[PDB]
RNA sequence: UCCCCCGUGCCCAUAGCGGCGUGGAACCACCCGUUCCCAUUCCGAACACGGAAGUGAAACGCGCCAGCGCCGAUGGUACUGGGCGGGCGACCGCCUGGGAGAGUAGGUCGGUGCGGGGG
RNA sequence: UCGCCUCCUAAAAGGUAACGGAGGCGCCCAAAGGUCCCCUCAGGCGGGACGGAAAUCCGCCGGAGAGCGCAAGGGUAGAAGGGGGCCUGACUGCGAGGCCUGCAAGCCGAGCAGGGGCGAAAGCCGGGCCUAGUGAACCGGUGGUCCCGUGUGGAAGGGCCAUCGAUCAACGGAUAAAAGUUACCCCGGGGAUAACAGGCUGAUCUCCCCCGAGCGUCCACAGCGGCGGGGAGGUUUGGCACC
RNA sequence: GCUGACUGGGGCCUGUAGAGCACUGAUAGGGCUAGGGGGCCCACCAGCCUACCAAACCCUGUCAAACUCCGAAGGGUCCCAGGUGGAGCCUGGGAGUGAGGGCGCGAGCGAUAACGUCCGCGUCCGAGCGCGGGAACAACCGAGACCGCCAGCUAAGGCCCCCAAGUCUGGGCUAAGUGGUAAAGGAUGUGGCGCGGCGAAGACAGCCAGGAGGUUGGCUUAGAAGCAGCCAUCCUUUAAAGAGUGCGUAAUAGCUCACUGGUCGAGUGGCGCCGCGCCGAAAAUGAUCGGGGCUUAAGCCCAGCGCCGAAGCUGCGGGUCUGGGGGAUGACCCCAGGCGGUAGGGGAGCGUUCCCGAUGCCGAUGAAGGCCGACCCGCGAGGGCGGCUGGAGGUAAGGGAAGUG
RNA sequence: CGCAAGGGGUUGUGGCGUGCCUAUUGAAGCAUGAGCCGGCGACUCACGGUCGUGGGCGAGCUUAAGCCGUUGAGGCGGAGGCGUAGGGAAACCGAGUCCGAACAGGGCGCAAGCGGGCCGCACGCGGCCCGCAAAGUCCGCGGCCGUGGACCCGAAACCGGG
């Protein structure tokens, strides 16, 4: 029988997964309120017809379609062009 | 159009689900059996995905 | 319609940085003042006001260059959906689609709408 | 070690385990909040009274490497950073529509109404750049409510609204209330699980081989073999937990 | 009631593979250069040099799960299309399961050990210990077993005998029984590509002759004469002979080979690859690739024709589950698919005890039970009928209860 | 055996073949249980509940105890229970109601006819009728759930009186 004293650790704790990311991709029809993106920082700037919540939480406020737009060094966006 | 004649010749037992599903989409069930389908992109889709189990010829 | 300038947006470096031109007739700026509205952690520097002698020096606008920046092929790899094999193993190979990153040839000192003043 | 947060492992959606790898939380701020108006950093090189190699200055050069209360990440000067003025929306009544999710919880929130804050105005304000700073129920306390109140009236006592007492941290929380010992031991079970032997493995062990520093008076290989390298065996000590 | 899996075409969402240092860190050398040993030192006013230490910075080379200037394949999702499937969606009734395992691939742990361990996708086993191949063998290759056939084609794997089918046909390789399973590392093993160098103005080997003078080159405690470490790194008479290739002396001596004369008078040495083989290779009851045996193969590699070979697929007959139809509702007919299965769900039936049916009906010309049957019906549980035994009970259709197998 | 075709008994060779149950990732397993045979041997019943189902009646349905009758004859009995209004913590209001100051909002709520033969025989469908509903109830049957020993067998032990 050999079980010499067994060492120990500690750094064995992690955090809960937050399921962040883009929740609605361009072309998708969305009602007002539908929280499109749900990032942490400003990865995606609020576009026309879009609203930013406490946590930069992007959400549409107009019943229409979705669509992004890369402005280069101006940061990406995500406006919901109205179903006109 | 140019209906394609696909014939299942290799057993699907041991292949991913999508592969067996492809066969189901083409209408193939038993072995050897050969069906004739319309030659359209959507049909070619599966036939090419499960081509390693079904021999194809044009008609 | 066409050049120049003044404001404005879009494209977000092939749209800049830095050298070298040049421009004031007009607009613009620098200036002359700062009693007055208004100001500075303290300075009319900056905001702000009233001006009009002088100027393009600065700043800005418009050209010129490739040196930095940037852009960047074509080929050929890497890697890999899917399919089929080899090695005791570490790993590796063929078929069929997809296909970089670097590197090289080379490209660039912008393009462009709306409204104004002026030839 | 046990709940929560950040990064990785996680295989470019989301999720994803191990006594895997590496760090944090159990607060705090009345200004570190709301709004309006201004301001822009760190360093590099110069030149600088005491001045370290950063005190504060001045001049270029510098798109962000500074800063943002604290971990880490994301974000960010076209401000979330730095300063100044009034302020209290760190609202009340709600809440379309969603994110996340077994359950209930967590989260984002336009918009309407009441009464306000700042701004000329457009407008923005339902705490804080963001993601940790937390605790169901039950039992009670304190304000209000006027809802019920045992024949009637009033009381006692409840309810409703608000709020309080948890290292219930074993952090979904058994009781308001809790340690040991048994070789004097007992039952139900397990080869789901240790000790023996076997099995698989071969780090460790035993063995031989490759290289030839360098020893051997001279000379690498009579006899040896530094640093290192490739193997075999399964008799050691173990690993695994397969009958 | 077409929305499913799967697929085609669009649109983005992303940071793995890979790669790359622009960020964060790690990096070897070099340059340049703050310092600091310290150095010539004219001595404070700097200074100069440095095969040491050494910032920052540049150049050349790289490294990363918690780095990213960059970045696939793919993957996710939405829209439009295919897609009638024991697809989907909604509501409700019944569950069982919450010990999984092997294989492949992507990670961790481990020691990139384990029939190890923990996740990810997939797939099989589980429940396909049903069938073929793999000698035997849950999970490797083949393939999803409704029943029957003394028919047929195939799969993997095979075709010399065991053992069904080629001692098949062309071109090669191997000589070990490699084949029939181990490494670094060795080696004039074989066979095939290369690419250079020498050679009929005579190479290669062997043999014959020379292989010298500078001098023992300078340098070492012993000495170091071609043979322990360097500078210069060369000369001489020459066909050609080194300041020397080994052997060897304590050191000289000696024997040699570098080179060329000469005979001889046709090829000959160098290295780089590729195939297959040799050694490297020792463990415990008796040996062997499954066995016998196999050598222009019965091994290995490459073409080809053809057969064998499953419960797969056809052919023939039958049963059953769904759906669609016939619909003369004929519950019987053709058409179309399906029918492995553990935990489980669902649906049909058989038999046992008893009650109504029974004041009935069977029964001594024999009840119930028992013992036989090669017959009849049914998919099956069974139900018949017949012979023997037995000797007094038994109980239809149609229903009802439950101490019911 | 039988006329026959065919059939019954035995088994010499050949081919193929890893007991049954249980428990498991995995068993012929050198894991459990069983010597063999016969007989006994384990998912029931009561009352509730929830679905489903065969009926009756349905803006309703239905009785309990008990009484009268039978002596394997059924009647009576509306106490009572469900159902016909949802909300609120409640007072309370009511197709509304609760939070709210609010005709803002929002949470529970409601908004049920007819496929349709016939026929009085208004150029009108009344309304009889209909599925079984609006829509429920009652009884039967079945599945599962609750309380009971609740599928059957098994402890080591605890307590009472002797
Ligand atoms: Mg907000
Ligand atoms: Mg297979
Ligand atoms: Mg992910
Ligand atoms: Mg992924
Ligand atoms: Mg303020
Ligand atoms: Mg919820
Ligand atoms: Mg009273
Ligand atoms: Mg060694
Ligand atoms: Mg052993
Ligand atoms: Mg295990
Ligand atoms: Mg469709
Ligand atoms: Mg779909
Ligand atoms: Mg698609
Ligand atoms: Mg990476
Ligand atoms: Mg990589
Ligand atoms: Mg797509
Ligand atoms: Mg299904
Ligand atoms: Mg269900
Ligand atoms: Mg588990
Ligand atoms: Mg397990
Ligand atoms: Mg487990
Ligand atoms: Mg599994
Ligand atoms: Mg698992
Ligand atoms: Mg698996
Ligand atoms: Mg492993
Ligand atoms: Mg395992
Ligand atoms: Mg393994
Ligand atoms: Mg586990
Ligand atoms: Mg299976
Ligand atoms: Mg099998
Ligand atoms: Mg077996
Ligand atoms: Mg098999
Ligand atoms: Mg076999
Ligand atoms: Mg089948
Ligand atoms: Mg054949
Ligand atoms: Mg074949
Ligand atoms: Mg034969
Ligand atoms: Mg060998
Ligand atoms: Mg070798
Ligand atoms: Mg041959
Ligand atoms: Mg078949
Ligand atoms: Mg059929
Ligand atoms: Mg079945
Ligand atoms: Mg009777
Ligand atoms: Mg008689
Ligand atoms: Mg009887
Ligand atoms: Mg019984
Ligand atoms: Mg057991
Ligand atoms: Mg099992
Ligand atoms: Mg036995
Ligand atoms: Mg046994
Ligand atoms: Mg047991
Ligand atoms: Mg048993
Ligand atoms: Mg026994
Ligand atoms: Mg018995
Ligand atoms: Mg018995
Ligand atoms: Mg009941
Ligand atoms: Mg019931
Ligand atoms: Mg309402
Ligand atoms: Mg019992
Ligand atoms: Mg007593």
């Amino acid at each position: 029988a050999h079980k010499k004293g067994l060492g120990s650790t500690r750094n064995g704790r992690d955090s809960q997964a937050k399921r962040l990311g883009v929740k609605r991709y361009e072309g998708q029809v969305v009602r007002a309120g539908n929280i499109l993106v749900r990032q942490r920082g400003t990865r995606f700037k609020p576009g026309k017809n879009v609203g930013m919540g406490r946590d930069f939480t992007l959400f549409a406020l107009v019943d229409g379609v979705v669509e992004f737009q890369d402005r280069g060094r101006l940061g990406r966006y995500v406006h919901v062009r109205p179903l006109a | 159009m140019p209906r394609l004649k696909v014939k299942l010749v290799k057993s699907p037992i041991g292949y991913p689900k999508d592969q067996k599903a492809a066969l189901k989409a083409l209408g193939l069930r038993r072995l050897q059996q050969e069906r004739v389908l319309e030659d359209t992109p959507a049909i070619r889709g599966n036939v090419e995905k499960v081509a390693h189990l079904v021999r194809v010829e044009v008609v």
Side-chain angles (χ1 to χ4, degrees):
Chain A
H2 263 191
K3 183 131 190 202
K4 323 284 235 46
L6 295 176
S8 47
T9 314
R10 10 60 102 138
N11 66 22
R13 23 194 199 323
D14 196 359
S15 200
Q16 271 316 146
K18 298 302 331 316
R19 310 118 204 308
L20 307 189
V22 169
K23 297 301 162 67
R24 294 292 198 269
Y25 315 71
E26 59 327 296
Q28 298 189 206
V29 257
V30 298
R31 283 184 61 181
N34 283 56
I35 76 145
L36 301 312
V37 180
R38 181 98 117 141
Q39 82 248 300
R40 280 282 175 252
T42 228
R43 239 180 105 150
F44 286 120
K45 316 220 234 180
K48 305 182 189 186
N49 288 134
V50 187
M52 182 119 127
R54 248 236 292 165
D55 18 43
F56 321 60
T57 292
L58 306 192
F59 65 109
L61 36 172
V62 278
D63 282 16
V65 160
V66 200
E67 66 187 304
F68 301 45
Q69 132 154 212
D70 202 278
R71 276 189 108 169
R73 320 221 154 153
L74 253 149
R76 283 139 72 151
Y77 295 67
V78 159
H79 359 243
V80 181
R81 174 200 48 175
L83 32 64
Chain B
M1 256 176 120
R3 313 180 301 163
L4 288 176
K5 185 178 182 179
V6 285
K7 180 190 182 187
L8 207 214
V9 295
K10 237 269 220 171
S11 185
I13 299 170
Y15 290 94
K17 294 290 154 192
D18 42 308
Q19 293 209 180
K20 292 171 184 144
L23 288 189
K24 171 187 287 287
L26 289 184
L28 299 153
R29 257 107 137 272
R30 24 162 72 153
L31 270 199
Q32 305 304 333
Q33 143 156 121
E34 52 181 36
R35 185 182 275 260
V36 293
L37 318 156
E38 289 296 339
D39 173 22
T40 89
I43 305 290
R44 291 266 173 173
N46 295 71
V47 180
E48 288 164 51
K49 173 185 193 64
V50 301
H52 51 97
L53 313 150
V54 348
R55 41 236 312 233
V56 188
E57 128 192 307
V58 195
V59 186

